[PDB]
From Swiss-Prot:
This is Nickel-binding periplasmic protein. Belongs to the bacterial solute-binding protein 5 family. The lineage of its organism: Bacteria, Pseudomonadati, Pseudomonadota, Gammaproteobacteria, Enterobacterales. InterPro entries: CntA-like, Peptide/Ni-bd, SBP_5, SBP_5_CS, SBP_5_dom. It holds the Pfam family SBP_bac_5. Its main location: periplasm. PANTHER family: NICKEL-BINDING PERIPLASMIC PROTEIN, PERIPLASMIC BINDING COMPONENT OF ABC TRANSPORTER. PROSITE patterns: SBP_BACTERIAL_5. Keywords: Nickel, Periplasm, Signal, Transport. CDD domains: PBP2_NikA. It comes from the Bacteria. One of its GO terms (molecular function) is metal cluster binding. It is found in: Periplasm. GO terms for cellular component: ATP-binding cassette (ABC) transporter complex, substrate-binding subunit-containing; membrane; outer membrane-bounded periplasmic space; periplasmic space.
């Protein structure tokens, strides 16, 4: 069955509620649900469900001209009234979408006609079209599939306009997708897709080698990186490694001792041998990161000065700040307090564990005692929320979230980035400037605000950037070259040709 493929994912795709988050899998939601505008690697958005659009001179009112030939998979039509209902179902659950600023921006959505949709905004929101293009929540399910005329409490059938339809879902075993034969756009060459539920990275690698699955598509945690490096040399397999898509990094808690001292955060940024870490743990498959965002990120080419590996400077910074070595000890003290920092991470993640040891060892050389706290997933998420960490592993989100969306969510208390920065003296000014840069339409001021925000975060050493990571692909040669989706969390199944 060449026109059919089998792949794998750690968990099930979920109920596929377009307006909700976990356990829903973003790649799966983007397979079924579609946006008004499609994000492109160009950095632009192109028409999709909305074939064109105008906006008022103050950029507060937007009128979208939708297509008239788009049906939901069940047969029901997609029109401006359906769109409006979806935005209403979403905005009735507005508080949960606080991370995403557009959900706080939309004042009204109404169908002017069957093909005219009007959206009104609190202000001129620059990232409007980008956040309309996101996998969630602003995508469309058939209003019939609502429950009590809402979606926040669940849906019935995941009926979308996209080129794929969920056909079967047996928990902890598999999910089966089929091609929407009445898809309005172009037909995918593949008809059937099977997602084997395989929670363990090694077990996924083993699954591929035995030929049980035909494709693996994910980030640097897709499969063991030593195994991936081996696959790349195996002429029976095909592998890929995209341009970098996002930053992997440490978040330093500016509100908790001793990471509340700028000198300490600065010294930590000088302490890690990143190239060694990347050669050792990442098997040279990623790039070294010096800044929160790579220079290639929009508005992020600022000429920020890198803090490169310099143990001697790291020591002198600590020495100067009052962190000295007691007699016969390797760990520094100050005011009776030892230089001890808690690095918490998911304990069943071999990569994080492997990255944590190196960091612990590197920072021990500069007189810092790092305590590896490996906990389960839920615990680490809880620490991130409540800001109960010294150091923590963190990720940026890639296009099109970087930089505006990642920056925007720094204002949300529930997020690790707010907690990490909570000890900053300029945290209100930063948060104020983040709100401004989203709503300003002066391009000179926008770049000026982005510079000031990123520079401050850089100059305050809030983060310890480690690497810029890439997308990884492992596939049977028969599938050919596998394209990359413009959005890091999407998997372009509709582009693959067996
Ligand atoms: C579990 S989703 C969610 C719901 C409410 C508040 C926060 C979140 C999770 N994240 C923000 C939302 N999240 C989008 C989403 O999950 O639809 C950001 C995000 C972006 C790209 C890949 C991933 C991801 O979680 C925080 C994070 O991922 O660090
Ligand atoms: Fe998320």
């Amino acid at each position: 069955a060449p026109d059919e493929i089998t792949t794998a994912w750690p968990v099930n795709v979920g109920p596929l509620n377009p307006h909700l988050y976990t356990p829903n899998q973003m790649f799966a939601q983007s397979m079924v649900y579609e946006p008004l505008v499609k994000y492109q690697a160009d950095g632009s958005v192109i028409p999709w469900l909305a074939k064109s659009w105008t906006h008022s001179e103050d950029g507060k009112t937007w009128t979208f001209t939708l297509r008239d030939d788009v049906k939901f998979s069940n047969g029901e039509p997609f029109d401006a009234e359906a769109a409006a209902e979806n935005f209403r179902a979403v905005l009735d659950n507005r508080q949960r979408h606080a991370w995403l600023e557009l959900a706080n921006q939309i004042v009204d959505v109404k169908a002017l006609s069957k093909t005219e949709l009007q959206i009104t905004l609190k202000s001129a929101y620059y990232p409007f079209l980008q956040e309309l293009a996101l996998p969630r929540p602003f995508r469309f399910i058939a209003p019939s599939q609502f429950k009590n005329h809402e979606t926040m409490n669940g849906i019935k059938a995941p009926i979308g306009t996209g080129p794929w339809i969920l056909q079967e879902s047996k928990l902890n075993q598999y999910d089966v997708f089929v091609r929407n034969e009445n898809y309005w756009g172009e037909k995918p060459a593949i008809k059937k897709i099977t997602f084997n539920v395989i929670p363990d990275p090694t077990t996924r690698a083993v699954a591929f080698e035995t030929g049980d699955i035909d494709l693996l598509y994910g980030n640097e945690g897709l499969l063991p990186l030593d195994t991936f490096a081996r696959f790349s040399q195996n002429p029976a397999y095909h592998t890929q490694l995209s341009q970098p898509i996002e930053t992997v990094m440490l978040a330093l808690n500016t509100a908790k001792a001793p990471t509340n001292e700028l000198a300490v955060r600065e010294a930590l940024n000088y302490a890690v041998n990143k190239k060694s870490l990347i050669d050792n743990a990442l098997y040279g498959t990623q790039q070294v990161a010096d800044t929160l965002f790579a220079p290639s990120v929009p508005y992020a080419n600022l000429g920020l000065k890198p803090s490169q590996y310099d143990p001697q400077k790291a020591k002198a910074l600590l020495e100067k700040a009052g962190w000295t070595l007691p007699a016969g000890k390797d760990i520094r003290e100050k005011n009776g307090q030892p230089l001890r920092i808690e690095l918490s991470f998911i304990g069943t993640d071999a990569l994080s564990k492997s990255m944590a040891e190196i960091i612990q060892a590197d920072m021990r050389q500069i007189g810092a005692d790092v305590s590896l706290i490996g906990e389960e997933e839920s615990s680490i998420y809880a620490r991130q929320r409540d800001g109960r960490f010294g150091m923590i592993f963190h990720r940026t989100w890639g296009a099109p979230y970087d930089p505006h969306a990642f920056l925007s969510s720094m204002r949300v208390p529930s997020h690790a980035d707010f907690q990490a920065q909570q000890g900053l003296a300029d945290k209100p000014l930063i948060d104020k400037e983040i709100g401004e840069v989203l709503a300003t339409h002066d391009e000179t001021q926008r770049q000026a605000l982005y510079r000031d925000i990123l520079t401050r975060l850089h100059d305050e050493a809030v983060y310890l950037p480690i690497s810029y990571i890439s997308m990884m692909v492992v596939s049977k040669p028969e599938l050919g070259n596998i394209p990359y989706a413009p959005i890091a969390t999407e998997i372009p199944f509709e582009q693959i040709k067996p």
